[PDB]
Design a protein around this ligand. Structure first.
Ligand code: SF4
Ligand code: SF4
Ligand code: SF4
Ligand code: SF4
Ligand code: SF4
Ligand code: FCO
Ligand code: FES
Ligand code: FES
Ligand code: 3NI
Lengths: 179, 416, 447, 137, 152, 79
């Protein structure tokens, strides 16, 4: 009960920024002994609870992942941006130089042995897209930016270790990379 | 007094009178963040990152362009300068589209080193996601313009160091792009000597050597060996980077020498590509259309039996390479010129060497040196290429010719 | 009239959304499984140098960044037209085996072990890696050690663990010095013990729930995999599509794949549906992943994993195991295989060699590299122009081939656990476990 | 010039039944010299690489130190001696190049007597400046 | 195509061997040809033995040079301080949406061209919308049609 | 059918190659005085890569012939 209350999620991430979180192999046992993991791709909760260190990887590319980022911000006090996708926009932003219609059209209609003859353009029930991929510091005020693809396990461990001691850390220059 | 004494960050510094603050800075030890100063190229004042403050004077002035004046107190690191440098770096990151995840130069980028040094954990300014073209038409160089800080170190190294003035700026203000001739692609350019000096000058991964991308990084090098290119006579000085038994990047030292590190295509593109060739390492034998692996005893026996049946009747020669060292050539002379006394030994360019040293020989009789150094064709007034194609013979001589006849008002006349 | 949503589907990679549209009487009219993320790795790359692709393409996923790395590397090696060197082959295979081991360790122990151990009706607070560390302190540590073994191989070879750079277009950047070779080999008797204990645990789970877990989303479909002469190869080999009852249907060279595989674009999801084109959608749809490989392979090459592969084959009516939950079992066999393949690559004097790269000019206009990622067959297909600039890319990824199997599995597990009202949580966990059986990287699926 | 260059051109215009050609296969080779090599009837190349224009005109194809596994001095026309450094050390074992020259000296009736590197003394010296006369030819 | 090779090769004759003079050497080919084709800049670079990149940089650095064929009637609106405080931006955007062409480009068939200029001098009669011939002192939102149809 | 074999002027097989990739070996020089181009082995250059074709070049390039009775006179040609 006295443990901390982190809760992660990814928005338009390739999962590497969490894969680096699970790259904390033996130290994950100690972190779990120090923090209890609420809503996250590791736990089976569906609605984010009120949390302390709300983590977010991946930029904003859809509409659903803006809503969950806004939710996470509304329900924490420190927000940690994992990765260059959440800090600088990342690799997702490479679709910002062509319109979203053209993105969905070259990757679902004219994509080198796809066989749809009706131009389906799959926006039926799924979140459509955003016209430009953006970092999460566009709809969410961020407190600890952690840059990298992915942030190394040492850096993630440092950010968690410093946020559980009760301070807002800025990632030092000797241990920060953009990869 | 030429030797002036200043105070940079408390540390006392010593410099020549005409030296800028950056010169007296880099002379002693002290570090000032720079992105557009290439040792050599005349200080261009574009990045505005080297700004330093003089005591008493509340304004800030570039250390690359402002001269050092006889005694003064320069402060390089404090809060306001760090704030302004972080803002400049963030402007560069927000204006152009910088994705380090896939950049060939993520470890060498000087915009990335500065960003990490100034703890740039953000962009602050709105990301303008405009579409700058990726010019990779050239099979050797690639110009990905959305990483271009606009430092002109590539225009200046192709205007004042190479001479084949291929790169210049296109438009004004924000639309300013680095372009080849008449706003065309680098492949379509008639005036690029494909040198790569534009890739050695670019700090920000815009211009990259394609064939050695992700391997020719200076941060991931196993060793850095200084040597001399052996391909031509100019003997450019090189700083070969070695990564697991292969040269991955050949950047030319000698930015203070008249050449300026502009190694040619054969040196920035054949030297690293030659460390990745087939490398026999076992004596072969023909067998008809396809070689077979032989032992050294077998191969040297079949190659000496054919050297005894062909030496009784004269019928024997040797074509050694003039790219070999004097040790190897002296060894070959020990066997061929002295032991078995063959008068049929040559050097794969013997016509050129013997023509040169039989045309120059009259003047050796008269007692003069009938040749000078190529760096003296930079201050000449009229250059006469007699039977020469210096682009395929010694490209630094051609670059000297171009710098002379464009930026130093010479005239060219050919007798070929 | 109304529908249930399990958004977000947890303990899988990526973004998913199971919708279960019921009728007025409260029974399942139909279920579908959407992937609700899309990035556009087939429109990013137009303009980029092909050499940039083995660094751009690992960013499609972090559970398998080396699978995309190596597929892109084989595509660019076919663009160059290089041999490639045997030492490069064996080093790439070592990195791929390390990735197989780490991805299957994460897939079993981190994502799918809670349901396998505590049952589909366990409380939500305990069903995670955290409650697994708490209650089972040794099994979570063993899975962490296996994942760490795989990622130590990947880190040794390519600098970083996630998104490594080790394979250039043309060869391999870095070999293995004997010290780290011996270091990796000194942990294999322990990692094989971990893998065999997991095999025994999952075999006791499948043997306990005898017939129910044998009809838990078990539909008869085709099995695509990669094969050597007759063996199970994970790096190279021909593509083999075994029909649902044993007959090899259209074994083909991975190069000419556009004449066999097609993609149907359904409106409700960003994931295309690849299928065997001659049979048509939805009758050419096949399976990939560990189950399909072991079903398509007639034999495996490794010694100690061959025994348990034989035990797998005498369970499935002439070699074709159709059960969805056995995707866990098969997975660990793969892991086992991977481990024992590592022991074979570390016993060869070519991983420590120094002839790793082969350079070439004359860039061809097309390059297709197909490897066998842990979740299934991965196809990179680049079309470049004369200048080496990417003109058109096509990535047919692992979870794509299994999209139809996952949709039909969610349909079958919904249509057996319906309740008119009150919509319990254990049936939701079973509806999620059908997806977690394949453990899909939805980021790869939606490049 | 001081060690190998012959005072008379012989390549092409003379038969030369045997030809030991050493080619650090770096610079594009004059194509007239390559043809002359192709009509020789036994060509022993000691090239380091297996590049195209040399594996065609070769009967033995021995290995070599490949310009980056050897060090040297390179005395030039302008006098002063440079220095080439061993960038990356050799991988295999060609074990010498003097071994090949010795096994050629062996069973040929000749010795070797390794000499010192001949000191390059700039044959063209400037004892006159801005004071020359023309030369009749 | 041959009409653009000697006219440019003759206007460069009184500048050969004289330092400077690329700004004037172009203002003349602009006044003659209406624009600066790529052939023009190519021959200028050949004759002056100045780099093609420098010629293109100077040709695209200054506003009054047009590398594409300009229209047969320019529509210079004044975006000066006096006109803008009066509301010339409204007139500019309506001639924009009315010709349907982008901010500083020509019509699809070379009839008009919009060229936002500095003060044309009538800073009293503001805003001014010159239609390549004469001033136009008031130019309220409705008076733009009665001139754009007339000059075409 | 078969591979293309260019025997050097004194016996050594120089660049035996598959007839498909021929543009990397054969070039054509266009001399002004004739409509006939001059193909040549590109690595040696014109006019040093020029070769012969026809019956003589075939019998010179072939190490043996397959037929029984023509083999005797082919051997008499080779000696
Ligand atoms: S920032 Fe990099 S590691 Fe993180 S999700 Fe994006 S691509 Fe993956
Ligand atoms: S140029 Fe430098 S700062 Fe820009 S993306 Fe590349 S590595 Fe990063
Ligand atoms: S390759 Fe050389 S000539 Fe060409 S643009 Fe670069 S520096 Fe200039
Ligand atoms: S291309 Fe590079 S060197 Fe040239 S201006 Fe841009 S950033 Fe500077
Ligand atoms: S000009 Fe080129 S080949 Fe010659 S020495 Fe310099 S770098 Fe080497
Ligand atoms: N396996 C796997 Fe990941 C997926 N889908 C890839 O490639
Ligand atoms: S660094 Fe001094 S201004 Fe560019
Ligand atoms: S204000 Fe527009 S004319 Fe001067
Ligand atoms: Ni994946």
């Amino acid at each position: 009960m006295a443990k901390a209350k982190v809760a992660t999620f990814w928005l338009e991430a390739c999962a590497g920024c969490h894969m680096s979180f699970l790259d904390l192999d033996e130290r994950l046992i100690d972190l779990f002994q120090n923090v209890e993991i609420l809503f996250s791709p590791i736990v089976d909760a569906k609605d984010i609870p009120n949390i302390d260190v709300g983590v977010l990887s991946g930029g904003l590319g859809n509409v659903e992942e803006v809503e969950l980022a806004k939710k996470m911000r509304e329900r924490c006090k420190y927000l940690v941006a994992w990765g260059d996708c959440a800090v600088f926009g990342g690799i997702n932003c490479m679709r910002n130089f062509i319109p979203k219609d053209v993105v969905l059209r070259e990757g679902y209609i004219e994509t080198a042995s796809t066989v749809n003859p009706q131009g389906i353009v799959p926006s039926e029930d799924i979140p459509e897209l955003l016209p430009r991929a953006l970092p999460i510091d566009y709809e969410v005020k961020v407190d600890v930016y952690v840059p990298g693809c992915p942030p190394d396990a040492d850096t993630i461990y440092y950010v968690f270790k410093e946020l559980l001691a009760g301070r807002v850390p800025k990632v030092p220059s000797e241990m920060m990379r953009y990869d | 007094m030429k030797e002036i004494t200043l105070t940079i960050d408390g540390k006392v510094c010593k410099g020549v009178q005409g030296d800028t603050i950056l010169d007296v800075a880099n002379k002693n030890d002290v570090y000032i963040p720079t992105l557009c100063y290439q040792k050599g190229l005349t200080p261009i004042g574009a990045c505005r990152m080297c700004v330093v403050q003089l005591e008493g004077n509340p304004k800030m002035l570039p250390s690359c362009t402002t001269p050092a004046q006889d005694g003064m107190v320069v402060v390089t690191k404090n809060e306001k300068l760090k704030d302004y440098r972080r803002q400049i770096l963030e402007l560069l990151f927000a204006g152009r589209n910088h994705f380090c995840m896939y950049c060939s130069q993520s470890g060498d980028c000087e915009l990335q080193r500065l960003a990490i040094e100034h703890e740039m954990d953000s962009v602050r300014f709105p990301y303008l996601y405009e579409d700058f073209e990726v010019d990779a038409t050239d099979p050797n160089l690639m110009m990905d313009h959305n990483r271009c800080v606009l430092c002109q170190r590539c225009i200046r190294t192709c205007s004042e160091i190479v001479g084949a003035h291929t790169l210049d700026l296109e438009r004004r203000g924000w639309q300013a792009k680095v372009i080849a001739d008449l706003g065309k692609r680098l492949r379509e350019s008639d005036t690029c000597v494909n040198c790569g000096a534009c890739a050695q000058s670019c700090p920000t991964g815009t211009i990259t050597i394609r064939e050695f991308a992700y391997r020719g990084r200076r941060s991931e090098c196993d060793a850095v060996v200084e040597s001399v290119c052996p391909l031509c006579a100019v003997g450019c000085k090189i700083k070969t980077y070695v990564r697991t038994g292969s040269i991955v990047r050949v950047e030319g030292t000698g930015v203070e020498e008249p050449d300026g590190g502009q190694l040619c295509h054969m040196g920035r593109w054949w030297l690293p590509e030659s460390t990745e060739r087939e490398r026999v390492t076992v004596p072969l034998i023909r067998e008809g259309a396809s070689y077979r692996e032989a032992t050294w005893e077998e191969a040297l026996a079949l190659a000496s039996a054919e050297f005894k049946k062909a030496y009784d009747q004269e019928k024997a020669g040797a074509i050694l390479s003039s790219l070999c060292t004097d040790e190897e050539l002296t060894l070959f002379s020990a066997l061929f010129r002295n032991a078995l006394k063959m008068k049929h030994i040559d050097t794969f360019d013997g016509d050129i060497i013997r023509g040169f040293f039989k045309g120059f020989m009259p003047f050796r009789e008269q007692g003069v040196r009938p040749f000078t150094a190529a760096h003296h064709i930079l201050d000449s007034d009229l250059i006469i290429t007699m039977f020469a194609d210096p682009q395929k013979e010694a490209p630094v001589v051609a670059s000297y010719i171009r710098v002379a006849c464009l930026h130093r008002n010479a005239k060219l006349m050919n007798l070929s | 009239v109304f529908k249930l949503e399990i958004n977000p589907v947890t303990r899988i990679e990526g973004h998913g959304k199971i919708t279960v549209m019921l009728d007025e009487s409260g029974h399942v009219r139909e279920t579908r499984f959407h992937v609700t993320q899309y990035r556009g790795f087939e429109v990013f790359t137009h303009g980029r140098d092909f050499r940039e692709m083995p660094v751009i393409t690992p960013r499609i996923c972090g559970i398998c960044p080396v699978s995309h790395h190596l597929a892109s590397a084989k595509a660019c090696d076919e663009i160059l037209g290089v041999t490639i060197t045997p030492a490069a082959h064996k080093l790439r295979e070592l990195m791929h085996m390390g990735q197989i081991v780490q991805s299957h360790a994460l897939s079993f122990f981190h994502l799918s072990s809670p349901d396998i151990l505590w049952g589909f009706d366990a409380p939500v607070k305990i069903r995670n890696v955290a409650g697994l560390v708490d209650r089972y302190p040794e099994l979570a540590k063993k899975g962490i050690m296996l994942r760490k073994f795989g990622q130590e191989i990947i880190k040794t070879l390519g600098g970083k663990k996630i998104h490594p750079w080790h394979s250039i277009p043309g060869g391999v950047n870095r070999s293995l010095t004997p010290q780290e070779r011996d270091a990796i080999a000194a942990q294999l008797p322990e990692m094989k013990s971990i893998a065999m204990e997991a095999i025994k645990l999952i075999k006791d789970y499948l043997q306990e729930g005898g017939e129910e877990l044998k009809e838990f989303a078990t539909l008869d479909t085709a099995y695509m995999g990669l094969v050597r002469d007759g063996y199970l190869e994970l790096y190279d080999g021909e593509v083999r599509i075994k029909a649902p009852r044993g007959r090899i249907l259209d074994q083909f060279d991975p190069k000419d794949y556009l004449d066999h595989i097609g993609e149907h674009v359904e409106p409700w999801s960003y994931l295309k549906f690849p299928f065997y084109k001659a049979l048509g959608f939805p009758h050419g749809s096949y399976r990939v992943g560990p189950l399909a490989r072991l079903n398509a392979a007639d034999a495996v090459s490794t010694p100690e994993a061959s025994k348990e592969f034989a035990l797998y084959k005498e369970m499935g009516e002439d070699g074709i195991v159709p059960y969805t939950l056995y995707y866990h079992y098969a997975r660990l066999i793969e892991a086992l295989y991977g481990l024992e393949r590592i022991e074979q690559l570390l016993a060869d004097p070519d991983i420590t060699s120094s002839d790793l790269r082969v350079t070439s000019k004359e860039i061809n206009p097309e390059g297709i590299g197909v490897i066998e990622a842990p979740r299934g067959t991965l196809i990179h297909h680049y079309q470049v122009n004369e200048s080496g600039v990417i003109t058109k890319v096509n990535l047919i990824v692992a979870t794509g081939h299994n999209n139809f199997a996952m949709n039909k599995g969610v349909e079958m597990v919904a249509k057996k656990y319906i309740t008119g009202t009150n919509v319990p949580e254990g049936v939701f966990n079973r509806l999620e476990h059908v997806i977690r059986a394949y453990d899909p990287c939805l980021s790869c699926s939606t490049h | 010039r001081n060690t190998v260059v012959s005072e008379n051109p012989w390549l092409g215009r003379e038969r030369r039944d045997f030809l030991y050609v050493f080619s650090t296969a770096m610079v594009p080779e004059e194509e007239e010299i390559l043809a002359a090599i192709s009509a020789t009837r036994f060509v022993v190349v000691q090239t380091p690489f297996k590049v195209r224009p040399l594996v065609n005109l070769a009967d033995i194809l021995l290995p070599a130190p490949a310009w980056y596994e050897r060090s040297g001095h390179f005395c030039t026309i302008e006098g002063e001696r440079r220095k080439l450094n061993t960038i990356v050390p050799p991988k295999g074992e060609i074990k010498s190049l003097h071994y090949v020259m010795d096994e050629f000296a062996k069973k040929l009736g000749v010795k070797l007597e390794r000499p010192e590197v001949s000191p390059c003394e700039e044959i063209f010296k400037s004892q006159l400046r801005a004071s020359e006369a023309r030369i009749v030819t | 195509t041959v009409d653009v090779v000697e006219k440019v090769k003759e206007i460069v004759a009184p500048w050969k061997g004289k330092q400077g003079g690329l700004i004037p050497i172009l203002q003349e080919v602009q006044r003659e040809l209406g624009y600066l084709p790529e052939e023009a800049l190519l021959t200028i670079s050949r004759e002056l033995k100045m780099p093609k990149a420098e010629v293109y940089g100077v040709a695209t650095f200054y506003a009054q040079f047009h590398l594409k064929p300009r229209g047969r009637h320019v529509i210079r609106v004044c975006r000066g301080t006096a006109c803008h405080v009066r509301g010339s931006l409204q007139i500019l955007e309506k001639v924009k949406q009315m010709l349907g062409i982008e901010e500083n480009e020509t019509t699809d068939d070379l009839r008009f061209t919009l060229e936002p200029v500095a003060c044309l001098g009538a800073c009293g009669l503001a805003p001014v919308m010159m239609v390549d011939e004469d001033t136009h002192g008031r130019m309220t939102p409705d008076k733009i049609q009665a001139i754009l149809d007339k000059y075409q």
